[PDB]
Amino acid sequence: GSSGSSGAAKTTSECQECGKIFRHSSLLIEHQALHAGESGPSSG
């Protein structure tokens, strides 16, 4: 549960929607697409 929300002590392309770290943005770009559909938990 929201464990280690940092990665490897360095700015990475981690999905803030779920929390999946991706080497290069690209990887995350294709991953995010999967999300496109459901409604995210509006936090504010």
Using CB under 5 A as the criterion, which residues of the chain lie in contact with Zn ion when the complex forms? 15, 17-18
Give the shortest CB-22-to-Zn ion separation in angstroms: 9
Give the shortest CB-10-to-Zn ion separation in angstroms: 19
Give the shortest CB-16-to-Zn ion separation in angstroms: 8
Please give the residue whose beta carbon sits closest to Zn ion in the complex.
15
The span from the CA of 10 to the CA of 13, in Å, is 10
Q: Which is nearer to Zn ion, 18 or 29 (CB)?
A: 18
26 CB-side CA count, 13 A: 2
Enclosing H/E stretch for 35: helix 25-35
